[PDB]
Amino acid sequence: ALESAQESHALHHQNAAALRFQFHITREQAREIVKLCPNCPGLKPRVLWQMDVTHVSEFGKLKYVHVTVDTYSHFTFATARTGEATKDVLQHLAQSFAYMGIPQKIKTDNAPAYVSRSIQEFLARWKISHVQAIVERTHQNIKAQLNKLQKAGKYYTPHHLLAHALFVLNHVNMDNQGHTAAERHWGPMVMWKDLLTGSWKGPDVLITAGRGYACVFPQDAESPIWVPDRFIRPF
Amino acid sequence: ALESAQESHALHHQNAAALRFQFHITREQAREIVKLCPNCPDWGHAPQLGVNPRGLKPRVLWQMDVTHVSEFGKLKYVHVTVDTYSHFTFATARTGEATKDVLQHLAQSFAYMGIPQKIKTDNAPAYVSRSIQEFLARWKISHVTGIPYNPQGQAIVERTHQNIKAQLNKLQKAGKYYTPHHLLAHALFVLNHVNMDNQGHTAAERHWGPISADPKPMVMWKDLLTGSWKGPDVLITAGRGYACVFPQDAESPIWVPDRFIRPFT
Amino acid sequence: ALESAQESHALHHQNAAALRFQFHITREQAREIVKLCPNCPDWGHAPQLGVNPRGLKPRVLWQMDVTHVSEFGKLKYVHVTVDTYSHFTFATARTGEATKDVLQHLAQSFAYMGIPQKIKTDNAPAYVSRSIQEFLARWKISHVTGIPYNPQGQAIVERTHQNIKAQLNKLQKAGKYYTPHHLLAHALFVLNHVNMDNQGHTAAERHWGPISADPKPMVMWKDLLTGSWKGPDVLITAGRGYACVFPQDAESPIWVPDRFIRPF
Amino acid sequence: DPKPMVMWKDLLTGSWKGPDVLITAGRGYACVFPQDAESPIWVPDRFIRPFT
Amino acid sequence: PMVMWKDLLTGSWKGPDVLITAGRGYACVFPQDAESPIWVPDRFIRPF
Amino acid sequence: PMVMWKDLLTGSWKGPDVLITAGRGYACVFPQDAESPIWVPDRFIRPFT
DNA sequence: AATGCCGCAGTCGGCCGACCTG
DNA sequence: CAGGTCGGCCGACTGCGGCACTCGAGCTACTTCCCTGTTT
DNA sequence: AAACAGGGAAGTAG
DNA sequence: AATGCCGCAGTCGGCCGACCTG
DNA sequence: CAGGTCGGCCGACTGCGGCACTCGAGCTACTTCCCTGTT
DNA sequence: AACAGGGAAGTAG
Ligand SMILES: [Zn+2]
């Protein structure tokens, strides 16, 4: 079972909690798997976001990367651009809004593009107000994730590898509490007994039950499975 | 007397009603006499038989196909992917058509949505290449090739094409946008976070919020594989032309058209 | 708050439900807001409006058009003449198509069916040629031209084309026939006399003979041209999508789609 | 003929023209259908006389 | 013709005024706003 | 009488335009850019504004 | 200067008489 | 045995749809397979 | 001389 | 190698508060 | 005045058609038009 | 100046 975690970390390089909640692996085993990796060592969502731009030398010409992260949910996004002009920030704003949604107000830096009238009028049209420890932390996180994923040098363009790393951070990199960045950002489970292995697996969402048969719905399984009430356990 | 009607059709190809009123036989006999004649035409007007299956969770079953928005010019090749549960849609105007474009769209959409258990698409040469096959294998995601020349197989993503084209034309008439990517991003934002259903629920929050289900009705069901009305069984989902019955003894849920669903109490 | 919805639609072009459940407005208000934007696309999937008239007496109103039966060879042009009351059909295999050929087909149809009060066809060059116009004037037969590119105004003869094509294909697969005229005559015979209706009445004796006059119902009627439900009145004929209402105060019978007739 | 075919008084010439076949009647008017006429016409019952 | 029409944008009943034409269940009513006529469904039209 | 209509030849929509008269399934619309009014079936008539 | 028509076939559902059973 | 029941029976209604003047050419992408010059 | 690499044609599908 | 779909928009109707009234 | 009625409002329902990889060329046929040739 | 080929032009199928 740990081999699946081996390929999972090789292709994604997630934190230990992610693997432990993905394959039900022991915490110490997850730590050992992470160590085996050679190059891998607000109150309401969508209210206030942070805007800043950071540069990465590996891109060369595409280091000009706008990044948007939430104050509360810490959901992350990035864009590969050739510059930091007004139109670049505008396009990044639009694409980030499509990715994530619309916050109440936005906190930015004092760059000339941020202060320019284009961004001001664009935000005014969208009914959002305009105003770095969190964003610089994410900059470290994304750059670390960029380096971790750079092992498999098969990505054709920086967009591909950037999207994969952002996916890892958003949906694969998962916290201690048992929720991904996506689940936290977007806001009766019954214990189920497997019959292939005879072990109780869950918790899983319940669909319905009747005539001694329970339609227990596994999280990983794509389709419902009908199981007798003898193999169910209230939770 | 019936055989006399038989050579009557063999000579003439009369219709059912004239057979009934000229040979004093029942309507069913005339209909089957018409059916039996080899020269009698084949019925192209078939009622609703096949239903395109849908996943029962977000990130389970996806559909993918290419289209053509000639306005973008060199960015006419638009790849789109719609989740079959929450109707969550995504697209990026990428020039050309090759395995590279499909892989890039896959990565970007994966980041956009998440991991679906399996993906179904059309039989375009890109979707059948080896490289994409081992790509899905290394990502541990099942692939379904689909039936050739059958757009109804991807009817869901074709309706998604309709929605995308409508929204793009609307926002293009609305004003002017810097880059085709900007217009596509705004259209996707509107569709997936603003263009919400009559139930007061956006597609995104359904794709990423808790699934809610009231006690589902117990309805009589007709099975195509036996020709008998067997039930009653729990009905998972229903709509306009799709219904997901699931008996206790069934391995996987059965998807049937709405014409074969009957209320039960 | 409606203004907020106004600029919201102007910026995003949303749907009605989002406006209704975000700005707390009436569903009617949301539909009006989505209607009022000129940049919003016009409704293309419109419901059915307009019904082809059909003379309630046989040999009153006819339809006519051409087709292309490619298997006839040089005789591939088929002229089709069909009644409206009884759907009696006639056809000929005339090589090419000209005013002389159209005139020959007219004479053959007159011999085969009779003299109609008026004929309504497409805007084909033959049917706009003057020669046919003064021929009809000499025979005292009115003419109707129709809107160009609009076969929907000749849907009756189009459906007759469908029927004739199906029958001729069936007969062609049935056996071997000497000449295309012979096969067309056999198909027309089948369609006119043998291919009987669903009410025990062959098309031939529907074309001629006594009119069936059942006690007509007293139904309620919606006036399309005034937007008011006015009635009840007399329902002359009915079928799949078409109806005929002839109120006392109206000079001529009215052709409306069936959905606007609500039984009383 | 199972249906009656009644005499009709035309109003254009004020002369009894017909007789013609009747379709329906009511409210003092009758849906009398002249054979030559292409469409039915509404005529007051005072101007319609039974014919046999 | 003097008729009643519903200001369905505001939900109220404004009028009376002239009615121009009809068709498609729509009455091209002309209010006191002489700028341009408007269109309203016949269901929200009342003769007066 | 400000009316949206469809050019039935190509299907591309031209308008808005002015309505001269209409009745019983047909509409007679006379756009300013055309020298003669256009008769159109009432299937392609929309009430612009 | 004039408008979507309708056959092929499935399908509901009442009607009716042979037949089960009170 | 007659009231109740199921079946034979058909009026009655509906979903799909091509009739429109006829037709193609050509695109790009991928794989399999065969052909001709290159290597040991 | 047997092996091998573009190169091409061809077939299928959108 | 694994099956038509649904948004736009009109329309029916049940719900319910205001208004008519025995 | 609360029973009686009416209008506002929305769940529920439904006819339609085009998303399908892209658009076009071409022939027949009568009439209106004036060039090129002849009164 | 004139009309009568006639080729074009336009238009609908
Ligand atoms: Zn790692």
Best residue of F17, F19, F48 to probe chain E, by most E CBs closer than 10 Å: F19
Do A214 and A147 share a structural domain?
no
Please tell me what DSSP assigns to residue A87: H
Can you tell me whether residue D29 is helix, strand or coil? strand
- Our count of domains for chain A comes to 2
**Cis before B47 (ω within 30):** no
Phi/psi-derived region of residue A220, left when phi > 0, alpha when psi is between -120 and 50, beta in every other case: alpha
How far is B249 from B252, CA to CA, in rounded Å?
9
A158: which residues sit within 8 A by CB, 6+ positions away?
A: A59, A62, A80
Would you say the C-beta of B157 is within 7 Å of strand I? no
Instruction: Compute CA distances A115 → A80, A119, B120, C16, whole Å.
Output: 21, 7, 46, 35
Quick one: closest CA in B to A165, which residue?
Answer: B111
Structure tokens at C85: 């009351």
Would you say the C-beta of B227 is within 7 Å of strand I? no
> What is the residue-wise DSSP string for chain B?
-HHHHHHHHHHH---HHHHHHHHT--HHHHHHHHHH-TTSPP-----S-------SSSSSEEEEEEEE-GGGGGG-EEEEEEETTT--EEEEE-SS-SHHHHHHHHHHHHHHS---SEEEE---HHHH-HHHHHHHHHTT-EEE---TT-GGGGHHHHHHHHHHHHHHHHHHHH---S-HHHHHHHHHHIIIIIS--TTS--HHHHHHSPP------EEEEB-TTTSSB---EEEEEE-SS-EEEE-TT-SS-EEE-GGGEE---
Spatial CA neighbour of A65 closest among A130, A143, A6: A143
Residue position matching structure tokens 């005013």: C99
Closest-CA distance, C89 to chain D, in angstroms, reads: 20
Closest-CA distance, C247 to chain D, in angstroms, reads: 9
Spatial CA neighbour of B262 closest among B233, B236, B225: B233
Instruction: Compute CA distances B121 → B53, B84, B112, B159, B256, whole Å.
Output: 13, 12, 19, 14, 21
Distance of CA F25 to the CA centre of its chain: 12
How far is C88 from C91, CA to CA, in rounded Å?
11
Strands across the sheet containing A76-81: A76-81, A64-70, A48-54, A105-107, A129-130
Do C247 and C151 share a structural domain?
no
- Answer yes or no: is A102 within a domain: yes
Instruction: Compute CA distances C168 → B12, C102, C186, C203, D30, whole Å.
Output: 11, 21, 9, 18, 45
Can you tell me whether residue D27 is helix, strand or coil? coil
Contact of B14 with C195, CB cutoff 8 Å = yes
Chain C residues close to D20, C-beta within 8 Å: none
Contact of D24 with D42, CB cutoff 8 Å = no
The residue range of the domain holding E20 is 1-48
Spatial CA neighbour of B135 closest among B123, B124, B146, B126: B126
Q: Which nucleotide is nearest to B254 (CA to C1')?
A: J3
How far is B38 from C174, CA to CA, in rounded Å?
9
How far is A179 from A75, CA to CA, in rounded Å?
12
Bridge partner list, A79: A66
Bridge partner list, A106: A49, A130
Contacts 24+ apart (CB under 8 A), A174-178: A174/A14, A174/A15, A174/A17, A174/A18, A174/A21, A175/A17, A176/A17, A178/A17, A178/A21
How far is B101 from B129, CA to CA, in rounded Å?
13
Structure tokens at A115: 């202060």
How far is A233 from A201, CA to CA, in rounded Å?
10
Closest-CA distance, C239 to chain B, in angstroms, reads: 18
How far is F26 from F24, CA to CA, in rounded Å?
6
Do A193 and A179 share a structural domain?
no
- Answer yes or no: is A27 within a domain: no
* L chain positions with any atom within 7 Å of a protein CB: 10-13
Q: Is residue D15 packed enough to be buried (19+ CB in 10 Å), middle (13-18) or exposed (0-12)?
A: exposed
Number of CB pairs < 8 Å for C and E?
Answer: 29
Determine how many CB atoms are found less than 10 A away from the CB of residue F25.
22
Determine how many CB atoms are found less than 10 A away from the CB of residue C128.
13
- Answer yes or no: is B114 within a domain: yes
- Answer yes or no: is B7 within a domain: no
Length of chain E: 48
Instruction: Compute CA distances F41 → A57, B97, C221, D32, F5, whole Å.
Output: 65, 43, 22, 32, 10
Can you tell me whether residue A233 is helix, strand or coil? strand
Can you tell me whether residue D16 is helix, strand or coil? strand
Instruction: Give the strand pairing for C142-144 and C118-121.
Output: parallel
* H chain positions with any atom within 7 Å of a protein CB: 8-11, 14-23, 28-32
Bridge partner list, C229: C222
Please tell me what DSSP assigns to residue A176: S
Write phi, then psi, for A75 (nearest 5 degrees).
Answer: -70, 145
How far is B156 from B154, CA to CA, in rounded Å?
5
In window 81-120 of C, residues with CB < 7 A from nucleic chain H are: none
Using the structure, give the distance in angstroms from the CA atom of C199 to the C1' atom of G15, rounded to a whole number: 19
Residue type, F13: W
CATH code for position A133: 3.30.420.10
Q: Among C32, C36, C224, whose Cβ lies nearest the Cβ of E23?
A: C224
Contact of A33 with A19, CB cutoff 8 Å = yes
Using the structure, give the distance in angstroms from the CA atom of B248 to the C1' atom of I9, rounded to a whole number: 55
Quick one: closest CA in B to A207, which residue?
Answer: B213
H10 C1' closest Cα residue: B27
- Answer yes or no: is C75 within a domain: yes
K13 C1' closest Cα residue: B240
How far is C99 from C83, CA to CA, in rounded Å?
21
Question: Determined by which method?
Answer: cryo-EM
Q: What angle do CA B102, B108, B113 make, to 5 degrees?
A: 115
In window 61-90 of B, residues with CB < 7 A from nucleic chain J are: 87
Instruction: Compute CA distances B139 → B81, B207, C46, whole Å.
Output: 17, 21, 46
- Answer yes or no: is B19 within a domain: no
Write phi, then psi, for A78 (nearest 5 degrees).
Answer: -150, 160
Contact of B12 with C190, CB cutoff 8 Å = yes
C49–F40: do the CB atoms touch at under 8 Å? no
Chain B residues close to A157, C-beta within 8 Å: 104
Spatial CA neighbour of B110 closest among E15, C145, A168: A168
> Separation of A26 CA from ligand 1 center, angstroms?
17
Do A140 and A90 share a structural domain?
yes
Chain F residues close to C49, C-beta within 8 Å: 25, 41-43
> Separation of A11 CA from ligand 1 center, angstroms?
8
- Answer yes or no: is B132 within a domain: yes
Do C184 and C110 share a structural domain?
yes
Q: Which residues of A157-173 are buried (b: 16+ CB within 10 A; e: fewer)?
A: ebbbbbbbbbbbbbbbb
Contact of C92 with C184, CB cutoff 8 Å = yes
Contacts 24+ apart (CB under 8 A), A201-207: A202/A235, A203/A235, A205/B211, A207/B213, A207/B216, A207/B234, A207/B236
Q: Is residue A98 packed enough to be buried (19+ CB in 10 Å), middle (13-18) or exposed (0-12)?
A: buried
Chain E residues close to C229, C-beta within 8 Å: none
> Separation of A22 CA from ligand 1 center, angstroms?
16
| H helix or E strand, kind and range, residue F3 | strand F2-5
Contact of C31 with C89, CB cutoff 8 Å = no
Closest-CA distance, F6 to chain E, in angstroms, reads: 16
How far is B210 from B40, CA to CA, in rounded Å?
55
Q: What angle do CA B211, B214, B215 make, to 5 degrees?
A: 130
How far is A134 from A146, CA to CA, in rounded Å?
18
- Answer yes or no: is B28 within a domain: no
F45: which residues sit within 8 A by CB, 6+ positions away?
A: E23, E24, F3, F4, F5, F22, F27, F29
Write phi, then psi, for B91 (nearest 5 degrees).
Answer: -160, 150
Spatial CA neighbour of C87 closest among C199, C249, C8: C199
Can you tell me whether residue A90 is helix, strand or coil? helix
Contact of A9 with A34, CB cutoff 8 Å = yes
Contact of B56 with B237, CB cutoff 8 Å = yes
Write phi, then psi, for B151 (nearest 5 degrees).
Answer: -60, -30
B13–C41: do the CB atoms touch at under 8 Å? no
How far is B59 from C152, CA to CA, in rounded Å?
46
How far is A22 from A87, CA to CA, in rounded Å?
41
> What is the residue-wise DSSP string for chain C?
-HHHHHHHHHHH---HHHHHHHHT--HHHHHHHHHH-TTSPPP-S----------SSSSSEEEEEE---GGGGGG--EEEEEESSS--EEEEE-SS--HHHHHHHHHHHHHHT---SEEEE---HHHHSHHHHHHHHHHT-EEE---TT-GGGGHHHHHHHHHHHHHHHHHHHH---S-HHHHHHHHHHIIIIIS--SSS--HHHHHSSPPP-PPPPEEEEEETTTTEE---EEEEEE-SSEEEE--TT-SS-EEEEGGGEE--
**Cis before C232 (ω within 30):** yes
F42–C51: do the CB atoms touch at under 8 Å? no
CATH code for position B249: 2.30.30.10
Q: Among C32, C225, C227, whose Cβ lies nearest the Cβ of E45?
A: C227
Q: Which nucleotide is nearest to B151 (CA to C1')?
A: K20
Chain B residues close to A210, C-beta within 8 Å: 234
Spatial CA neighbour of A141 closest among A13, A2, A51: A13
Please tell me what DSSP assigns to residue A116: S
Bridge partner list, A48: A105
Do C241 and C113 share a structural domain?
no
Spatial CA neighbour of C81 closest among C125, C123, C129, C114: C114
Phi/psi-derived region of residue C58, left when phi > 0, alpha when psi is between -120 and 50, beta in every other case: beta
Instruction: Give the strand pairing for E40-41 and F26-29.
Output: unpaired
E24–C224: do the CB atoms touch at under 8 Å? yes
Q: What angle do CA A163, A167, A168 make, to 5 degrees?
A: 120
Can you tell me whether residue F32 is helix, strand or coil? coil
Do C232 and C199 share a structural domain?
no
Bridge partner list, D43: D30
Contact of C250 with C231, CB cutoff 8 Å = no
C213–D23: do the CB atoms touch at under 8 Å? yes
Do A133 and A92 share a structural domain?
yes
Do A174 and A204 share a structural domain?
no
Contacts 24+ apart (CB under 8 A), C108-111: C109/C81
Count helices and strands (H / E) in chain F: 0, 5
Using the structure, give the distance in angstroms from the CA atom of B216 to the C1' atom of K27, rounded to a whole number: 62
